[PDB]
Amino acid sequence: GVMDVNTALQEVLKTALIHDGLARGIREAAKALDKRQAHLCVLASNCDEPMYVKLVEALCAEHQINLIKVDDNKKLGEWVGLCKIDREGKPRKVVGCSCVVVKDYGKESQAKDVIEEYFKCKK
């Protein structure tokens, strides 16, 4: 592979946007985990709610679903797509996201391969 590990999530998130396979927010993520239609989850390390982190971690662990950590919620939301593009091209309007669930993968081999390799290396 050529793409970096941390920068390879953008392709998957964009393709899940295009194919409508994203559960955004804690309520939708928890509902998807209970429905166990989830494939993987994305968690934001920077947050002010320890109960949020505990609930997401326990739901991911007890449903044998892999979890990914992200630096901050604003970058996570910018990846997710809850932003508007200015004339120059920067996202002045960003709404942070603390948890994301990928319900359907995008039909991209390169994007999935690196994430699967990282998950296998973690295990």
Binding site: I26, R27, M51, K54, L55, L59, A61, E62
Partner: peptide, 16 residues
């Protein structure tokens, strides 16, 4: 505020 949390209870062992 955070209506998801009250649906689940958590023990120290990590159970839901």
């Amino acid at each position: 505020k955070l209506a998801v949390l009250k649906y689940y209870k958590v023990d120290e062992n990590g159970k839901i």
